[PDB]
Design a protein around this ligand. Structure first.
Ligand SMILES: C[C@@H]1O[C@@H](O)[C@H](O[C@H]2OC(C(=O)O)=C[C@H](O)[C@H]2O)[C@H](O)[C@H]1O
Length: 363
């Protein structure tokens, strides 16, 4: 029941399930594998087991050639996320192929379309729409690159993107942030007055809090946002925990509507909150009192969402598949999948930040 034990169990199950050539979407550079591999590389640093490092490197090498060339969806913030695996790979090998690949992804920022205030469109196919998920897809990578190449322009970039998102999607009443915002107000889900989508979808908010929790330490010392983001995170975590499931300790697909019978407890979102809370506590951004909420979620997660198959495979169920911006009925109707990379990555990542607290609990 130690966090890392489950993390390795799930990691090995996924790796045994897919060769790096099969890791879905097969032979594509995408954030599905990106988040899972970020988890795998984090587990590597925590255990020192070379095969976690080698598996991640295998996927990178399948897509990045001898000259650092990489094929990717050029209009999506989503394409940048996997770039996060390039930093630990480069730091360990010093192979310039990874820095060259990272530069191709970093060069995308200047080619992307933006809203009138400068917020990146989530994709070319989603004109003038900012989705919370985008903060994680393009934020952390930008800061990691900023520190690697001493390009301060990227600090301002992330600060702007984050402020624009919070400004347009944060709900005063609940403290939760709406999934998406359409400056053009052309999408059917765009509120005629605010331009926001109608629901608080767990994972989207989860991507946001994990981002804040990880990006604070990347900012230069004394940076104005070290305090802005810490405070934003405290308020969001406070808001989020107000909706934790009293019985299971988990969170619902649609955060603020757990009473509805068509709603349900979703795994990846819960894990992302667990990660942000654990991370926040370890870095001193959140009151250590949150440890109980965290350990309660861990208990419910393992108890209600995990099991081992007759064959010995560790399974995490109720992970929502890739999802777009929409209405309530669309969100609750999303396919629930077992070991979907969205959830596997979130699960493993959460276990790596949880472990430390788990071992110092009571001290
Ligand atoms: C190409 C597919 O586009 C969407 O269906 C999904 O990606 C979106 O949803 C999510 C998510 O966390 O569910 C994250 C991305 O930021 C967003 O673009 C699929 O995952 C994509 O494969």
């Amino acid at each position: 029941k130690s966090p890392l034990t489950y993390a390795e169990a799930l990691a090995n199950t996924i790796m045994n399930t897919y060769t790096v050539e099969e890791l879905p979407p097969a032979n594509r550079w995408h954030y599905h594998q990106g988040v899972f591999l970020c988890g795998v590389l984090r587990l590597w640093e925590a255990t020192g087991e070379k095969r976690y490092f080698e598996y991640a490197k295998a996927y990178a090498d399948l897509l990045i050639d001898d000259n650092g060339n990489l094929l990717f969806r050029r209009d999506e913030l989503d394409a940048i996320q996997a770039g996060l695996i390039l930093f630990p790979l480069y730091e360990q090998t010093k192979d310039e192929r990874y820095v060259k690949a990272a530069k191709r992804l970093r060069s995308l920022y200047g080619t992307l379309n933006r809203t009138s205030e400068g917020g990146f469109w989530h994709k070319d196919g989603y004109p003038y729409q900012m989705w919370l998920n985008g903060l994680y897809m393009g934020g952390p990578f930008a800061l990691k690159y900023a520190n690697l190449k001493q390009e301060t322009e990227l600090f301002d970039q992330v600060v702007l993107q984050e402020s624009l998102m919070r400004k347009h999607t944060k709900d005063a009443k609940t403290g939760l942030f709406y999934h998406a915002w359409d400056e053009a107000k052309k999408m059917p889900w765009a509120n005629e007055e605010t331009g926001c989508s109608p629901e608080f979808w767990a994972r989207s908010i989860g991507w946001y809090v994990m981002s804040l929790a990880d990006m604070i330490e990347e900012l230069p010392k004394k940076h104005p946002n070290r305090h802005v983001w810490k405070n934003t995170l405290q308020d969001m975590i406070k808001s989020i925990c107000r909706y934790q499931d009293k019985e299971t300790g988990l969170w619902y697909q649609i955060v603020d509507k757990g009473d509805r019978s068509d709603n349900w407890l979703e795994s990846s979102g819960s894990c992302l909150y667990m990660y942000a809370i654990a991370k926040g506590i370890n870095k001193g951004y959140l009151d250590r009192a949150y440890e109980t909420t965290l350990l309660k979620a861990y208990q419910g997660l393992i108890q209600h969402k995990t099991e081992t198959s007759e064959d010995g495979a560790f399974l995490v169920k109720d992970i929502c598949v890739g999802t777009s911006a929409g209405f309530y009925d669309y969100y609750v109707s999303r396919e629930r999948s077992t070991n979907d990379l969205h959830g596997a990555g979130a699960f493993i990542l959460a276990m790596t930040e949880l472990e430390p607290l788990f071992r110092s609990a009571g001290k």
